[PDB]
Scaffold this active site. Structure first.
Site, short mmCIF file in Angstrom:
data_model
loop_
_atom_site.label_atom_id
_atom_site.label_comp_id
_atom_site.label_asym_id
_atom_site.label_seq_id
_atom_site.Cartn_x
_atom_site.Cartn_y
_atom_site.Cartn_z
N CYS A 1 0.82 -1.21 0.00
CA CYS A 1 0.00 0.00 0.00
C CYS A 1 0.86 1.26 0.00
O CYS A 1 0.85 2.03 -0.97
CB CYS A 1 -0.92 -0.03 1.23
SG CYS A 1 -2.40 -1.09 0.92
N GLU B 1 4.18 1.30 1.99
CA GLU B 1 5.28 0.97 2.91
C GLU B 1 6.64 1.05 2.22
O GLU B 1 6.91 0.25 1.32
CB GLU B 1 5.06 -0.42 3.51
CG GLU B 1 3.64 -0.56 4.09
CD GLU B 1 2.62 -1.19 3.14
OE1 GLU B 1 2.83 -2.34 2.70
OE2 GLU B 1 1.65 -0.51 2.76
#
Lengths: 793, 792
Positions: free
Chosen positions: A433, A435
């Protein structure tokens, strides 16, 4: 001018795209059965070598499937967009759902009766031999009790594999699988054998060699199928294509790639074979424009049209991957999503701008294909060229949700603060997502857990209780708080208690994967597993982290500020009425009009997201308390925990775990997504809202923060729309927010897709850090997206 | 200096005879329960699974009290029988279902019901044993070398580890309940700020669960005693059973309050450890030191009853038995589990440790006269003359016991390995000859057997074994320009095969750590509780691995025979010697030059006659082994250290060695331990002892073994005893580590061979342990018969 528009894909690409959109997801049995037989046959081996035998059996025996029209081949499943089963992690939910999975609301899959019977047989092997069953045995009873009551969950790597990594694609492109074997052979030659430590390192090395010999066989099995198809093929043009594919798969990935088309096939083989070895998602291509571009530049024969078509086929292949999860977990990762994040742009290791022609071809591919995958992203830094930002913004304006945007200027110092070198941090990509990691140097565990900060607030105000359970310490009843100092002292004590359990649960799963499922194929593609003679699961990576995600940040901040203003400062109500109002759910069901009046007073307090310093700093403080606790802890790989703040599709699901809150939200209602202001509560426009969000400490949340905005499409129209849109991003990144991404869609379009889903199968929009088909999302998630604030300039 | 010995009670005789007459069976109960516990607990960490294993067995194994016993606890329903531990290995048990009752070494009866029960349980085990994992860690070259008889790690490959003296004194004082309290306090004090606490807490919870079931086990014997008492018609026996019931309620859950309770604590520990694991050499160690406080504090007990309880302990020690595969059983022959118990020595403050229980332990050996315990004495500079001379009277009974150990070598040898002076002074002996600081060590004191004479064979054949290239090509023996060339080649072969030895040991070490860490045993050795880790993962303060050399005198006399007969005196060439060795000195061909060469070699000077030149070659060959071994470490953070002892395998492993330059023929026996070759020390026991003491005993800190055998006539009377004690003091002053004695007439052994039915009670030393002579295979019997008979 700034608006250039987008080209169209070839007809072949449109057919390949539509094959994805029309595919019915199935569960399939062959990989699970083969894996199971490999375990049965190899009880006596050390785990790492057993896992080499697993991938050997699968790579040698899994069905090989080439789909009509593909130029880039490799299929995890016989049926398009279907899912294997990986019983080594967990299995019992698959069998419990044999008859319901085809009909569940989130991510249904067809399980034919023969497949169910085949899985039933294989699952007889598994009771108590999974990684999950061992992980659970390591956890304390209090830790399990807190998870049972919804404080936090480690489901992701408990029920499935790890993944969440960007491997060394460029190394395999250069030297191939045969080159990996050579590096391992040299490490064997140079092993220090003077102590006992060499024995397990040699087991690892031999497991890696066996795995990569089998991986070479797998590619050759695709070359063999391509040749069989070519000998039946009637169109001489498609015959030539199938002959070229067979040649490609003979060469790569066994050897380095010698054309751009071979380079794309090397990429897709790595991408798919990792997700055959393990069900871990967030296998992230990362800096695809950087490691692929030398292979485009050196290909003097390829046309720009054919090179684009190949990139398009890659985008489409990325959508062929699918993954089932248990019926509740599927609601947290909804949309047939495996989160393959692919970013372009940014800086080189030397700090010069990294844009190249393939950067823009990747943007074009997204415009050509318009599917949920890859999770396409751009890096932005102070020297990003205006044309690259504006082109990306012009792509965002299509309303697919992509590219998400990431701020080098925050991420690089955030990584440095965690011990990543400046050279490695400049080379970061995004996992899953939001990170960030130094690619092929990290075992990051970037989605290890979901942790409900709003639930911790609930429990703090109930003196450590949840229901009729004493779940946290008795930090005091809220009616005894003398002021906000007392609240914060009690909240920090609840946070320390529950975060310690979070770390226990994470580390138990971490130990379990190390003891039972170390991975010899994946590990060879991350520094420094070969040099050390150790798998990723045993700490072979240069950098090691564990990343748990906070839920309910704006909900916690606005609730704590409401107590500060409405109780202590303005004395609109007492601590005792607040406690009674919260317990009664603001009289939702009893109709108590004092509680309703109190609800109205609380709802109208200032809120995070309106550029109001007072309340914004409470949100910052509440997020910091979580992030500061998490970072105190370490994992068994010698690495550091670091907080992230992102919701994937679970801010509805985990809102169901939280009773009424002091900001006025009723029991079980949704929480806010990531660091975004609460749905509909930022009412002063996108600049004011961005200003609030940037006041949080993004640097300490180095597993990544997630900020969603949604625009009225007409506000972005024209050159002045792009201008404003680019200026908004620069503003927010200059003020040190880490990430932002955009939906660009009319409310009526979402509503229509709800009323007539069969006419909106191709509507793709952003959920949180990934995009999905709107119609496959559950109504309650659809409604949450619709409820988000509509921004406009 | 001759008091004689008292006689045991009629009870003790009846109990003793029960052991002699027992027919050993294989039993299935423990193996079936163990297997069900594995099946039920697949999901647990190994340490917790192992706690569930011992909880199921302690809760459910048959409880058996035998007629007349004062000290109770049975590993098997039938006396002198064996359980099966399939977690280490199983397939040889089932392969032998029909042959184990008739095999030459240590037969056992397997009834059909038992084989059916074991057949079913064994279906669980393929690939889940420690052995199957250990083999998977080993290189092909290492397995090939073992296939060709260079060395074997069978002991801990097929079976459990053991080889330890646990903290009996701690359990005597605080009980199992006190073990649980210490662990509960470790749990309370755990640093939980990192991830390291998770596995430590698993270990702690496993230990607590194990000791809760251990308490139940002792209570189950209390119930059965109380039941038997209710049914007893004799009133005196009824009171005994009631007193046994009361003992078993108190201990070992709590600390002992009488000497009879302390004896019951000791035996529960001794037996339950060998229920948890089949590892042998569970050694009582300094029994007279940790038991004596409980005798002194017991104001009520009479001397005679205290003696009869010690006798009952001796007999219980003989109730334990162990089957091994048909070949392994030949190497540990005699229904032998090697539980070594020593008396005397020094305190940790360096004063003499003799006490009245010391002498009662000697009397128990004279009362009972069975193979177990492997009874030993410590000997130091301040050993009282009365203790040495009493030990020598006991030796004259011809049982082989006590074996004698020299503090003045063993303590600096242990110090050389990092053992503190305080801990070294408290040493006991493990198994045959292996010294350790008790309840502080995971020593692996019999991890492997390594054939130095085979390495010599292979050295002379340029790394070949039967046209198979097993070691490096260090050169054909015909190209040696002199002894320097040989020694260079021999050291290269030794480094090659000892590296593989260490690989094989460490592979078994890793396998035990991964699959079978022990939560019951581990709690009784420092510092497992304090560290929160099992013995198998390095919880002990001291960690070692000990592999044994075979063929030391054979190698030394062979190497010297090349030195003297080939290079120095030029009586044959390297080419003729090569030819004679290949041809087995003409044993088949009748070649007379090869027979003449054999005669020439056989008559070279030999180790064991106080001749410096040949003795120093034996010293040098043994050093080459010991110096290589100690270069290596194990996964527990500890050090390899060589020992030299054969148990019953010097015949067995002689079969792996072709003809040698000292003239021995292919497949003939090797020498036992550091003893001179059979019949080759011809100048008497002082000369032979002087030779053995020229070896470096200090570097062989896993223990050396020296056998002597005397004619009973030469130790008769007061003059005999003085000579005999003077011999012992001569050898220990000259820094030998250990000596032990058979005292027996040749005709006694020969008569046991022809009329074994009238000599079932004849007990003699094999090597580091005693056995019923009639139980040993004829070739082992003949080897013992062939040992040099000494005379003063």
């Amino acid at each position: 001018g700034l608006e250039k528009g987008f080209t169209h894909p070839t007809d072949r690409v449109v057919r390949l795209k539509n094959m994805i959109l029309h595919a019915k997801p199935y569960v399939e049995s062959e990989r699970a059965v083969l894996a199971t037989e490999a375990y049965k046959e190899n009880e006596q081996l050390p785990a790492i070598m057993r896992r080499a035998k697993v991938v050997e059996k699968i790579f040698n025996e899994l069905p090989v499937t080439i789909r009509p029209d593909e130029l880039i081949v490799g299929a995890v499943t016989i049926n398009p967009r279907s899912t294997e089963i990986c019983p080594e992690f967990s299995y019992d939910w698959v069998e419990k759902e044999f008859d319901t999975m085809a009909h569940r609301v989130a991510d249904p899959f067809i399980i034919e009766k023969k497949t169910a019977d085949e899985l039933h047989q294989a699952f007889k092997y598994w009771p108590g031999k999974t990684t999950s069953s061992l992980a659970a045995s390591y956890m304390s009873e209090g830790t399990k009790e807190s998870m049972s009551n919804g404080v936090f969950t480690v489901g992701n790597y408990f029920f499935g594999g790890i993944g969440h990594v960007s491997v060394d694609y460029g190394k395999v492109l250069k030297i191939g699988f045969r080159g990996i074997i050579d590096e391992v052979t040299r490490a064997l030659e140079n092993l220090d054998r003077s102590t006992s430590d060499y024995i397990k390192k040699e087991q690892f090395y031999n497991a890696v060699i066996l795995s990569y010999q089998a991986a070479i066989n797998f590619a050759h099995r695709y070359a063999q199928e391509a040749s069989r198809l070519a000998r039946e093929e009637r169109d001489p043009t498609r015959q030539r294509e199938l002959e070229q594919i067979a040649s490609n798969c003979t060469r790569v990935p066994e050897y380095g790639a010698t054309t751009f088309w071979e380079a794309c096939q090397t990429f897709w083989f790595i991408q798919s074979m990792l997700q055959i070895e393990s069900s871990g998602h967030s296998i992230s291509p990362g800096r695809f424009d950087q490691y692929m571009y030398p292979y485009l530049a050196a290909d003097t024969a390829i046309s720009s049209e054919f090179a684009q078509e190949l990139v398009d086929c890659c985008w489409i292949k990325l959508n062929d991957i699918n993954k089932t999860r248990d019926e509740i977990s599927a609601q947290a990762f909804a949309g047939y999503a495996v989160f393959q994040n692919l970013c372009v742009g940014g800086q080189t290791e030397d700090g010069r701008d990294a844009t190249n022609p393939l950067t823009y071809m990747c943007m074009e591919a997204t415009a050509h294909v318009r599917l949920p995958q890859p999770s396409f992203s751009i890096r932005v830094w102070q020297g990003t060229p205006d044309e690259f930002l504006y082109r990306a913004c012009e792509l965002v304006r299509l309303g697919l949700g992509v590219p998400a945007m990431y701020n080098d200027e925050v991420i690089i110092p955030a990584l440095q603060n965690r011990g990543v070198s400046l050279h490695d941090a400049r080379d970061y990509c995004i996992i899953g997502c939001v990170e960030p990691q130094a690619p092929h140097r990290t075992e990051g565990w970037h989605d290890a857990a979901f942790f409900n900060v709003a639930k911790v607030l609930e429990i703090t105000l109930n003196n450590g209780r949840s229901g009729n359970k004493q779940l946290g310490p008795m930090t005091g009843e809220m009616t005894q708080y003398a002021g906000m100092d007392d609240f914060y002292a009690a909240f920090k004590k609840q946070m320390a208690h529950f975060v310690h359990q979070l770390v226990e649960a994470c580390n138990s799963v971490d130990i379990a994967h190390g003891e039972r499922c170390p991975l010899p194929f994946l590990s060879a593609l991350v520094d420094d597993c070969i040099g050390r003679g150790k798998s990723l699961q045993e700490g072979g990576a240069i950098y090691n982290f564990t990343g748990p995600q906070a839920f309910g940040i704006a909900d916690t901040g606005d609730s704590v500020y409401a107590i500060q203003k409405q109780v202590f400062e303005d004395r609109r109500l007492t601590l005792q009425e607040l406690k009674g109002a919260l317990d009664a759910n603001f009289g939702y069901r009893s109709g108590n009009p004092r509680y309703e009046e109190i609800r109205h007073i609380l709802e109208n307090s200032p809120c995070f997201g309106n550029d109001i310093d007072d309340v914004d700093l409470v949100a910052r403080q509440c997020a910091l308390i979580y992030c500061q606790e998490v970072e105190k802890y370490t994992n068994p790989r010698g690495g550091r925990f670091q907080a992230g703040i992102y919701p994937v599709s679970a801010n509805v699901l985990f809102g169901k775990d939280v009773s009424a809150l002091p900001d006025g939200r009723l029991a079980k209602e949704p929480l806010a997504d990531g660091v975004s202001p609460r749905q509909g509560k930022d009412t002063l426009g996108p600049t004011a809202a961005a200003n609030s969000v940037a006041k949080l400490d993004h640097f300490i949340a180095s597993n990544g923060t997630l900020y969603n905005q949604k625009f009225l499409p007409s506000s972005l129209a024209g050159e002045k729309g792009l201008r404003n849109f680019g200026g908004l991003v620069r503003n927010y990144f200059d003020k040190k927010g880490m990430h932002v991404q955009f939906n660009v869609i009319d409310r009526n379009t979402l509503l229509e897709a709800q009323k007539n889903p069969q006419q909106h199968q191709d509507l793709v929009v952003r959920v949180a850090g990934y995009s999905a088909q709107f119609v496959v999302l559950a109504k309650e998630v659809q409604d949450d997206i619709i409820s988000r604030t509509e921004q406009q300039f």
